[PDB]
Design an enzyme around this catalytic site. Structure first.
Site, PDB file in Angstrom:
ATOM      1  N   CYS A   1       0.842  -1.188   0.000  1.00  0.00           N
ATOM      2  CA  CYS A   1       0.000   0.000   0.000  1.00  0.00           C
ATOM      3  C   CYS A   1       0.882   1.244   0.000  1.00  0.00           C
ATOM      4  O   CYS A   1       1.627   1.481   0.957  1.00  0.00           O
ATOM      5  CB  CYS A   1      -0.934  -0.016   1.210  1.00  0.00           C
TER       6      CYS A   1
ATOM      7  N   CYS B   1       0.749   3.765   2.928  1.00  0.00           N
ATOM      8  CA  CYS B   1       1.349   3.185   4.132  1.00  0.00           C
ATOM      9  C   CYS B   1       2.844   3.447   4.172  1.00  0.00           C
ATOM     10  O   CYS B   1       3.399   3.817   5.218  1.00  0.00           O
ATOM     11  CB  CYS B   1       1.081   1.682   4.182  1.00  0.00           C
TER      12      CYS B   1
END
Length: 112
Positions: free
Chosen positions: A36, A39
């Site tokens: 991600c 993230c």
């Protein structure tokens, strides 16, 4: 990195939540995944804040790949998701990679 504690199991999750309740210290959790993008962008700040607030706030990391059962119980649908836990239960949350909002969340719950 930093002062972040990596959660590797439901058992460890429970034990950390229990310690934050006994210690009367708030817990901030980063629910994250290495695939991600956002993230990866916010993880350095989470780590830096973990050093700055060491002793006032407990910082946990839950990789949703490593502990899917804990991710499921937390009701995550997007990442990163930050949860605050106080006295064993979810007190607040923040979704997404805003640096200002993460700083503000930690300050809010560190002032007690």
């Amino acid at each position: 990195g930093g002062s972040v504690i990596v959660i590797d199991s439901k058992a460890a999750w429970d034990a950390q939540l229990a310690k934050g309740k006994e210690e009367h210290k708030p817990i901030v959790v980063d629910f994250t995944a290495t695939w991600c993008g956002p993230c990866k962008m916010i993880a350095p700040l989470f780590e830096t804040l973990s050093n700055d607030y060491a002793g006032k706030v407990i910082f946990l990391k839950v990789d949703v790949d490593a502990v899917a059962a804990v991710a499921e119980a937390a009701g995550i649908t997007a990442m990163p998701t930050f949860h605050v836990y106080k006295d064993g239960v979810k007190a607040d949350d923040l979704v997404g990679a805003s640096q200002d909002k993460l700083k503000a969340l930690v300050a809010k719950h560190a002032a007690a």
